Each structure stands twice: as C-alpha cells, then as structure tokens.
RNA sequence: GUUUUCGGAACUGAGGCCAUGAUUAAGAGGGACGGCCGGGGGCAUUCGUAUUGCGCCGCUAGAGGUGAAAUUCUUGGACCGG
C-alpha cells in the first residue's frame, strides 16, 4: 500500500501545521505539496468550539494523521509551521507544539522543521480600529 | 565830451598746488567658491511580500468567529495545500 522502499530508507512527505487561535490544521501532503495524504483538524476531533484550538484536539488530530500516513507508507515527515500571518498575529497557536509532539511519539520520523507564516512587507489595514479591540 | 579804465557779477579754458580725496572689514549680515551631507521637495521608473478575487489541480467536512456563542461561507466542494 504505497511505494516499494527498503527498510533502511524512509519515504518523505511534508506536513503543514496551521496553528491559529481558533483551531489547528494538520495537513500532510507530498514533497511537492500538490497531492495530499491526510488532512484532519482539531475541530474534527472535539465537538466544542472552545476546545477547537486546544492542545488535546491537536494531539488527537496529529495521531490520526500519523496513523493514516503510516498506513500509506510514509515514515518520515517534513514539518513546516504556520501562524495566521498577514496583519494578524505571528505567534503560532497552542496546538502547534502538542501536534508536533503527538506525531513525534506516534513513531513518525522527523525531517527538518521550518517556519512559514505569511510575513507581509507592508500590509493592508488591520481589522481593529484606531483605538483597537476593547475587550 | 567820451569810450575805455576801475569795480561788480554770471558764463568760462588752460595751469600750479592738496602727503589731491575711499576708516575698518563686526565671534553683524548678504553674495561667491570647494568637498561633502541629509526618510527635505517634484517628476518618471523599479522592486517586495502580504490582502482580496479568479482559473486549474489534490484530499476533503467543515471552516469563521467568542469569555461562551450566534449571525456568516460550506458535497452548486467551504477552509487547507500547490
Ligand atoms: Mg565680515
Ligand atoms: Mg454542524
Ligand atoms: Mg487556495
């Protein structure tokens, strides 16, 4: 069920970890990034908008993704981590670290980590007003 | 008798003489000149991601928002990846 690769060699795919403050996306796709293998989110595991971005939902999503990818023959993963970016926050949400550790403990081999978040040169106007959000 | 002379003026042309006649260059100010200097200004040109939208491809059931939610977009493929 996948490529024919010797025991010593590992098949590589990239994993996009979109860690917003509303939920977390774990999205494994090919090295080229065009064909996807498993994409499950934190909202697909917890039925409560509160916990959509919790570390627990990210852990469950990462475990599901790692299991499906192992069933599909990929043993090594390339991690690229993204925050919301744009004019909004640049710090990744709480689910990123939990998802990374979850897919590490799931037997997956770890490639090289990279931080790919949209960093505007000089963006448009941020959503909040001149006085900003007041809550 | 009488036009000169003298006196007075104005208009004057050659001379001699003046120790011939211009204070200083403001820790005032202009204006020059030289090498620079600077997100100063105007015109044109060029690049950078990001945002939004569109086309195609993949897998897709959620995605968004919040203190918690709802309004809102979603198998007439939303969100995510290229
Ligand atoms: Mg002077
Ligand atoms: Mg529902
Ligand atoms: Mg897209």
GROMACS .gro file of C-alpha atoms (C1' of nucleotides) and ligand atoms in nm:
model
  220
    1UNK     CA    1   0.000   0.000   0.000
    2UNK     CA    2   0.243   0.264  -0.124
    3UNK     CA    3   0.596   0.289  -0.261
    4UNK     CA    4   0.835  -0.006  -0.259
    5UNK     CA    5   1.120   0.120  -0.041
    6UNK     CA    6   1.385  -0.075   0.150
    7UNK     CA    7   1.375  -0.097   0.529
    8UNK     CA    8   1.666   0.140   0.586
    9UNK     CA    9   1.526   0.416   0.363
   10UNK     CA   10   1.236   0.641   0.462
   11UNK     CA   11   0.970   0.798   0.242
   12UNK     CA   12   0.929   1.173   0.290
   13UNK     CA   13   0.623   1.394   0.294
   14UNK     CA   14   0.572   1.748   0.418
   15UNK     CA   15   0.334   1.844   0.698
   16UNK     CA   16   0.168   2.185   0.726
   17UNK     CA   17   0.080   2.277   1.084
   18UNK     CA   18  -0.152   2.579   1.074
   19UNK     CA   19  -0.181   2.680   1.440
   20UNK     CA   20  -0.437   2.959   1.466
   21UNK     CA   21  -0.611   3.063   1.786
   22UNK     CA   22  -0.942   2.914   1.668
   23UNK     CA   23  -0.822   2.566   1.568
   24UNK     CA   24  -0.525   2.369   1.434
   25UNK     CA   25  -0.474   2.219   1.088
   26UNK     CA   26  -0.250   1.915   1.044
   27UNK     CA   27  -0.213   1.865   0.669
   28UNK     CA   28   0.032   1.608   0.531
   29UNK     CA   29   0.100   1.621   0.158
   30UNK     CA   30   0.370   1.521  -0.089
   31UNK     CA   31   0.715   1.677  -0.109
   32UNK     CA   32   0.582   1.892  -0.394
   33UNK     CA   33   0.282   1.983  -0.178
   34UNK     CA   34   0.032   1.918  -0.457
   35UNK     CA   35  -0.116   1.580  -0.357
   36UNK     CA   36  -0.243   1.545   0.000
   37UNK     CA   37  -0.237   1.227   0.208
   38UNK     CA   38  -0.415   1.322   0.531
   39UNK     CA   39  -0.572   1.649   0.648
   40UNK     CA   40  -0.757   1.637   0.980
   41UNK     CA   41  -0.822   1.937   1.202
   42UNK     CA   42  -0.878   1.993   1.572
   43UNK     CA   43  -1.245   2.063   1.506
   44UNK     CA   44  -1.284   1.715   1.358
   45UNK     CA   45  -1.192   1.561   1.696
   46UNK     CA   46  -1.364   1.781   1.958
   47UNK     CA   47  -1.731   1.880   1.937
   48UNK     CA   48  -1.692   2.211   2.120
   49UNK     CA   49  -1.574   2.541   1.974
   50UNK     CA   50  -1.389   2.611   2.300
   51UNK     CA   51  -1.152   2.316   2.257
   52UNK     CA   52  -1.113   2.353   1.880
   53UNK     CA   53  -0.766   2.506   1.932
   54UNK     CA   54  -0.678   2.316   2.249
   55UNK     CA   55  -0.361   2.106   2.268
   56UNK     CA   56  -0.580   1.797   2.315
   57UNK     CA   57  -0.758   1.833   1.980
   58UNK     CA   58  -0.425   1.895   1.809
   59UNK     CA   59  -0.284   1.581   1.973
   60UNK     CA   60  -0.576   1.370   1.852
   61UNK     CA   61  -0.555   1.515   1.500
   62UNK     CA   62  -0.180   1.454   1.483
   63UNK     CA   63  -0.224   1.094   1.599
   64UNK     CA   64  -0.493   1.032   1.336
   65UNK     CA   65  -0.280   1.188   1.061
   66UNK     CA   66   0.029   0.991   1.164
   67UNK     CA   67  -0.165   0.664   1.172
   68UNK     CA   68  -0.312   0.720   0.826
   69UNK     CA   69   0.024   0.822   0.680
   70UNK     CA   70   0.194   0.516   0.832
   71UNK     CA   71  -0.080   0.307   0.674
   72UNK     CA   72   0.003   0.485   0.347
   73UNK     CA   73   0.375   0.402   0.366
   74UNK     CA   74   0.535   0.733   0.471
   75UNK     CA   75   0.763   0.709   0.774
   76UNK     CA   76   0.944   1.045   0.767
   77UNK     CA   77   0.781   1.388   0.771
   78UNK     CA   78   0.893   1.740   0.684
   79UNK     CA   79   0.745   1.993   0.925
   80UNK     CA   80   0.651   2.345   0.818
   81UNK     CA   81   0.471   2.554   1.078
   82UNK     CA   82   0.241   2.843   1.012
   83UNK     CA   83   0.056   3.105   1.205
   84UNK     CA   84  -0.230   3.324   1.084
   85UNK     CA   85   0.012   3.582   0.948
   86UNK     CA   86  -0.083   3.877   0.735
   87UNK     CA   87  -0.156   4.176   0.955
   88UNK     CA   88  -0.273   3.944   1.236
   89UNK     CA   89  -0.063   3.756   1.491
   90UNK     CA   90   0.268   3.590   1.408
   91UNK     CA   91   0.297   3.360   1.711
   92UNK     CA   92   0.162   3.009   1.642
   93UNK     CA   93  -0.137   2.893   1.843
   94UNK     CA   94  -0.128   2.649   2.133
   95UNK     CA   95  -0.197   2.344   1.916
   96UNK     CA   96   0.131   2.351   1.723
   97UNK     CA   97   0.357   2.209   1.993
   98UNK     CA   98   0.107   1.946   2.105
   99UNK     CA   99   0.056   1.830   1.745
  100UNK     CA  100   0.431   1.816   1.683
  101UNK     CA  101   0.494   1.611   1.997
  102UNK     CA  102   0.194   1.388   1.924
  103UNK     CA  103   0.319   1.297   1.577
  104UNK     CA  104   0.670   1.254   1.720
  105UNK     CA  105   0.551   1.000   1.978
  106UNK     CA  106   0.345   0.825   1.707
  107UNK     CA  107   0.658   0.665   1.560
  108UNK     CA  108   0.695   0.919   1.279
  109UNK     CA  109   1.045   1.018   1.177
  110UNK     CA  110   1.110   1.393   1.182
  111UNK     CA  111   1.273   1.576   0.893
  112UNK     CA  112   1.370   1.943   0.910
  113UNK     CA  113   1.145   2.199   1.076
  114UNK     CA  114   1.070   2.530   0.906
  115UNK     CA  115   0.859   2.835   0.996
  116UNK     CA  116   0.647   2.951   0.701
  117UNK     CA  117   0.400   3.216   0.809
  118UNK     CA  118   0.279   3.500   0.585
  119UNK     CA  119   0.505   3.793   0.668
  120UNK     CA  120   0.384   4.099   0.476
  121UNK     CA  121   0.635   4.357   0.369
  122UNK     CA  122   0.379   4.631   0.435
  123UNK     CA  123   0.025   4.503   0.462
  124UNK     CA  124  -0.325   4.648   0.447
  125UNK     CA  125  -0.508   4.795   0.747
  126UNK     CA  126  -0.553   4.561   1.043
  127UNK     CA  127  -0.912   4.480   1.136
  128UNK     CA  128  -0.925   4.663   1.469
  129UNK     CA  129  -1.000   5.034   1.471
  130UNK     CA  130  -0.769   5.320   1.559
  131UNK     CA  131  -0.847   5.259   1.927
  132UNK     CA  132  -0.837   4.884   1.871
  133UNK     CA  133  -1.025   4.598   2.030
  134UNK     CA  134  -1.151   4.689   2.376
  135UNK     CA  135  -1.226   4.351   2.533
  136G      C1'  136   3.267  16.514  -2.421
  137U      C1'  137   3.354  16.043  -2.413
  138U      C1'  138   3.473  15.514  -2.477
  139U      C1'  139   3.779  15.287  -2.210
  140U      C1'  140   3.985  15.203  -1.710
  141C      C1'  141   3.835  15.060  -1.243
  142G      C1'  142   3.453  14.793  -0.966
  143G      C1'  143   3.074  14.408  -0.979
  144A      C1'  144   2.866  13.979  -1.145
  145A      C1'  145   2.730  13.538  -1.445
  146C      C1'  146   2.936  13.222  -1.827
  147U      C1'  147   3.423  13.012  -1.856
  148G      C1'  148   3.959  12.739  -2.082
  149A      C1'  149   4.419  12.604  -1.992
  150G      C1'  150   4.777  12.563  -1.527
  151G      C1'  151   5.027  12.503  -1.025
  152C      C1'  152   4.928  12.308  -0.570
  153C      C1'  153   4.643  11.930  -0.192
  154A      C1'  154   5.128  11.369   0.158
  155U      C1'  155   4.489  11.556  -0.403
  156G      C1'  156   4.000  11.295  -0.194
  157A      C1'  157   3.751  10.577  -0.048
  158U      C1'  158   3.831  10.442   0.835
  159U      C1'  159   3.755   9.928   0.943
  160A      C1'  160   3.640   9.464   0.734
  161A      C1'  161   3.184   9.311   1.350
  162G      C1'  162   3.274   8.564   1.731
  163A      C1'  163   2.654   9.158   1.239
  164G      C1'  164   2.454   9.040   0.768
  165G      C1'  165   2.414   8.911   0.228
  166G      C1'  166   2.660   8.702  -0.212
  167A      C1'  167   3.067   8.395  -0.433
  168C      C1'  168   3.377   7.936  -0.431
  169G      C1'  169   3.516   7.374  -0.251
  170G      C1'  170   3.439   6.886  -0.075
  171C      C1'  171   3.063   6.676   0.133
  172C      C1'  172   2.576   6.566   0.388
  173G      C1'  173   2.059   6.454   0.485
  174G      C1'  174   1.308   5.941   0.548
  175G      C1'  175   1.398   6.761   0.264
  176G      C1'  176   1.054   6.859  -0.227
  177G      C1'  177   0.870   6.748  -0.753
  178C      C1'  178   0.852   6.427  -1.200
  179A      C1'  179   0.934   5.935  -1.408
  180U      C1'  180   1.088   5.440  -1.312
  181U      C1'  181   1.162   4.982  -1.029
  182C      C1'  182   1.109   4.606  -0.671
  183G      C1'  183   0.882   4.332  -0.219
  184U      C1'  184   0.585   4.018   0.016
  185A      C1'  185   0.106   4.035   0.208
  186U      C1'  186  -0.456   4.101   0.128
  187U      C1'  187  -0.866   4.018  -0.182
  188G      C1'  188  -1.065   3.789  -0.617
  189C      C1'  189  -1.030   3.448  -1.040
  190G      C1'  190  -0.868   2.975  -1.328
  191C      C1'  191  -0.688   2.480  -1.273
  192C      C1'  192  -0.526   2.052  -0.971
  193G      C1'  193  -0.546   1.726  -0.455
  194C      C1'  194  -0.782   1.546  -0.043
  195U      C1'  195  -1.175   1.695   0.158
  196A      C1'  196  -1.640   1.816   0.626
  197G      C1'  197  -1.615   2.171   0.800
  198A      C1'  198  -1.433   2.650   0.818
  199G      C1'  199  -1.514   3.179   1.075
  200G      C1'  200  -1.572   3.392   1.481
  201U      C1'  201  -1.607   3.443   2.100
  202G      C1'  202  -1.528   3.486   2.753
  203A      C1'  203  -1.920   3.135   2.553
  204A      C1'  204  -2.177   3.165   2.138
  205A      C1'  205  -2.467   3.317   1.749
  206U      C1'  206  -2.510   3.599   1.278
  207U      C1'  207  -2.176   3.423   0.816
  208C      C1'  208  -1.950   3.082   0.399
  209U      C1'  209  -1.995   2.538   0.310
  210U      C1'  210  -2.071   1.779  -0.110
  211G      C1'  211  -2.373   2.411  -0.683
  212G      C1'  212  -1.658   2.148  -0.257
  213A      C1'  213  -1.616   2.597   0.209
  214C      C1'  214  -1.137   2.601   0.495
  215C      C1'  215  -0.623   2.389   0.389
  216G      C1'  216  -0.209   2.252   0.019
  217G      C1'  217   0.022   2.352  -0.500
  218LIG    MG1  218   3.277   9.006   0.780
  219LIG    MG1  219  -2.277   2.113   1.245
  220LIG    MG1  220  -0.606   2.823  -0.243
   0.00000   0.00000   0.00000
